[PDB]
């Protein structure tokens, strides 16, 4: 039992949901620095984690490919590692549990690795409906730049809205 992209929603969410940062890798990761240092992050996709990673920032949990190529060096005692399997244009039940588990594990200052098989993109809804006030959220908007999200009450209700729009499927 699993929500689902609707044509109308899918069109939607091809405009960015928070404010686009423009410019190439990395660019946009360097104008932000300083916002991130100051808040807990989430990031999705392997390249939004990676080059986070490289500005000197942890992110309090990452959404990323389950078939990346990429590898553990020491962080990698604190750190955790969940899979979910989350078709594209999907939102499912794991996939909620597992992010809403994440923040969980990040409270008691671990920071997270979701492994994602399928496509991780639309857990951007979920990361801010789970997190708590001030958080931010990051992803990449493709040959554009990067978005990021601020947690507010304000943007809570629209993540709720389009969950509460897409198609639920028993």
Do not use: W
Not at 127 to 141: D, E, N, R, S
Not at 163 to 169: D, F, H, N, P, R
Request: with cysteine; net charge positive; hydrophobic share 40%.
């Amino acid at each position: 039992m699993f929500f689902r992209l609707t044509r109308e929603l899918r069109d939607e969410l091809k405009r960015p949901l928070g404010e686009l940062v423009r410019g190439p890798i990395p660019e946009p990761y360097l104008k932000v620095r300083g916002e991130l240092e100051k808040h807990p992050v989430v990031t999705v996709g392997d390249v939004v984690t990676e080059n986070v990673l490289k500005i000197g920032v942890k992110p309090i949990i990452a959404l990323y490919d389950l078939k990346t190529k990429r590898k553990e060096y020491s962080i990698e005692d604190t750190a955790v590692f969940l899979t979910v399997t989350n078709p594209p244009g999907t939102i499912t039940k794991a996939l909620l549990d597992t992010v809403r588990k994440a923040f969980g594990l990040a409270e008691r200052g671990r920071n997270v690795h979701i492994l994602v098989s399928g496509e991780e993109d639309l857990a951007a809804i979920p990361a801010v409906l789970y997190a708590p006030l001030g958080t931010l959220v990051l992803y990449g908007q493709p040959d554009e730049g990067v978005v990021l999200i601020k947690v507010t009450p304000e943007c809570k209700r629209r993540c709720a809205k389009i969950l509460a729009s897409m198609e639920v499927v028993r």
